[PDB]
Amino acid sequence: HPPCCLYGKCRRYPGCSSASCCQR
Questions:
Q1: CA-to-CA distance for 9 and 15, rounded, in angstroms?
Q2: Which residue positions does Glycine amide occur at?
Q3: Are 16 and 4 in contact (CB under 8 A)?
């Protein structure tokens, strides 16, 4: 799938899983 943080639609996926990037 993309990076974890891109387009602003929330993925907690395939080795993000430190990167929250949903949260503000």
A1: 16
A2: 24
A3: yes
